Design an enzyme around this catalytic site. Structure first.
Site, short mmCIF file in Angstrom:
data_model
loop_
_atom_site.label_atom_id
_atom_site.label_comp_id
_atom_site.label_asym_id
_atom_site.label_seq_id
_atom_site.Cartn_x
_atom_site.Cartn_y
_atom_site.Cartn_z
N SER A 1 95.92 30.26 -17.78
CA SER A 1 96.67 30.60 -18.97
C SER A 1 98.08 31.06 -18.61
CB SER A 1 95.96 31.72 -19.73
OG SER A 1 94.68 31.27 -20.14
N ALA B 1 95.66 28.70 -24.47
CA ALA B 1 94.40 29.44 -24.45
C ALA B 1 93.37 28.76 -23.54
CB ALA B 1 93.85 29.54 -25.87
N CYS B 2 92.57 29.59 -22.88
CA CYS B 2 91.51 29.11 -21.99
C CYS B 2 90.34 30.09 -22.06
CB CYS B 2 92.04 28.97 -20.56
SG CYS B 2 92.08 30.58 -19.73
N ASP B 3 89.23 29.82 -21.36
CA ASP B 3 88.07 30.70 -21.45
C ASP B 3 88.35 32.06 -20.80
OD1 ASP B 3 87.74 30.79 -18.74
OD2 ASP B 3 85.78 29.91 -18.70
#
Length: 97
Positions: A17, A9-11
């Site tokens: 991702s 997960a990432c922003d």
């Protein structure tokens, strides 16, 4: 209670991702661990049942927060093959053990 779920997960839930998920996924499948599942999603979206969470150190704090009871692994670079390789070997070791 068996560790078999890995999610990245990432922003953006997409950018880095995608690459992280693909590489890890391939290694896992190669290791014959069809029992382990791999997917990716935005940080805002992480199921509480997840056992392993993999994100960039800059956002690992966030993931820890959503589930500080989960296992979190922090990365430093998108193509940090050394870290990826080490993490994979470790998970394999933890799988048997």
């Amino acid at each position: 209670s068996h560790v078999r779920k890995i999610i990245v997960a990432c922003d953006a839930g997409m950018g880095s991702s995608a690459m992280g998920a693909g590489v890890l996924r391939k290694k896992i499948q190669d290791a014959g661990l069809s029992q382990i599942s791999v997917t990716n999603s935005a940080i805002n979206n992480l199921p509480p049942d997840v056992d392993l969470v993999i994100t960039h150190r800059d956002l690992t704090e966030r993931a820890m927060r959503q589930v500080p009871q989960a296992q979190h692994i922090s990365l430093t670079n998108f193509l940090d093959s050394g870290l990826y390789t080490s993490l994979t070997e470790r998970l394999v070791a933890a799988q048997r053990h």
